[PDB]
Every structure is written in C-alpha cells, then in structure tokens.
Design a protein around this ligand. Structure first.
Ligand SMILES: *[C@@H]1O[C@H](CO)[C@@H](O)[C@H](O)[C@H]1NC(C)=O
Ligand SMILES: *[C@@H]1O[C@H](CO)[C@@H](O)[C@H](O)[C@H]1NC(C)=O
Lengths: 50, 100
C-alpha cells in the first residue's frame, strides 16, 4: 500500500510507524447534580432596561 | 623581505620532520519522518484528509531514503578502498620508529 504498486523488489522498505488501538473510552466530569436555574433567568417576571 | 641578488643563492643545511592533522567530515546522521504521525497524531478525524497529500509524503520519504543510502555509500567509499585485510606484524624492528 505504501509503495502504491503490486510488485516489490528487494530492500529495507521503512514502513509507517506501528500504533495501538484504544479499545476503551472514559468520561470524567466534576460532581455536579443540581440543575441550573433556568426558570430564574428565563421566566423572570421583570426585565431590566437595555 | 628577501635579500635577493643576481648571483646569490641560499641552500638549507638541515631538515625537520613535521606532522599535521587534517579533519574532514564523511557522513551525517540518517533520519526518517513519519508524515501522518507528525501531522495528525492518533486521530481518526485527521489522517482522512491526508489522502490528498500522501503523494507529497511519499516524495519526502523517497528523498530521505536517497539521502540515507548516499550516506552509507560515502562511508563505504572513504574507508573500504582496499579489500585484502592485513594483520599487523608482531616484531616491530622498524629501525627506530615507534608506532605504538
Ligand atoms: C413560566 O412562564 C410561563 C409563561 O411565561 C408561566 O405560565 C409559568 O407560570 C412560569 N413558571 C414559573 C415556574 O415561573
Ligand atoms: C641538525 O639538527 C639536529 C637537531 O636540531 C642537530 O642535532 C644537528 O646537529 C643539526 N645538524 C648540524 C650539521 O648542525
């Protein structure tokens, strides 16, 4: 594939570096439980002047 | 200034043996570059847009391989002039010269 041909002659042929597959995945978030006060700032009865 | 006349010559009466050192580079460090690893890096999102520049990557790798084989050729050519390998003699007896 690297040579882009079907026939390879003699040589050392330094190919691409090897890799390791990351088979797993994790998620790490801080300890927050209470929801944000959406009603306080969206459902406010009064709004300030511009 | 040189005391030059038209019937005068100067002739040495003694000799001095001298030794000097000359230093010349022969080869440099051989290197190779993995273009995909250097550019994207463990990224499936990347290395998918490098399919267009893989030709440039191949060109760079070919140039670097040519440089490396040239370095090996230089190293071989400089020191391997003669093929038969001669073992150093045991008895020195070189008339006085000390090659230790
Ligand atoms: C939210 O807003 C709607 C209409 O603006 C209103 O009917 C409702 O009572 C509000 N709720 C709260 C908790 O403020
Ligand atoms: C030539 O030089 C050597 C060492 O400098 C000295 O021993 C020798 O006497 C010299 N020759 C003459 C003819 O003076």
């Amino acid at each position: 594939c690297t040579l882009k041909s079907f026939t390879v002659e003699k040589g050392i042929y330094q190919t691409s570096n090897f890799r390791v597959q990351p088979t797993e995945s994790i998620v790490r978030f801080p300890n927050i439980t209470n929801l944000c006060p959406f009603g306080e700032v969206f459902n406010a009865t009064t709004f300030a002047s511009v | 200034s040189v005391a030059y006349s038209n019937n005068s010559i100067a002739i040495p009466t003694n000799f001095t043996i001298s030794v000097t050192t000359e230093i010349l580079p022969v080869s440099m460090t051989k290197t190779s570059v993995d273009c995909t690893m250097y550019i994207c890096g463990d990224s499936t999102e990347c290395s998918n847009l490098l399919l267009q520049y893989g030709s440039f990557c191949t060109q760079l790798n070919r140039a670097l391989t040519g440089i490396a084989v040239e370095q090996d050729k230089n190293t071989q050519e400089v020191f391997a002039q003669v093929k038969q390998i001669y073992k150093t003699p045991q008895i020195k007896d070189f008339g006085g010269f000390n090659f230790s």
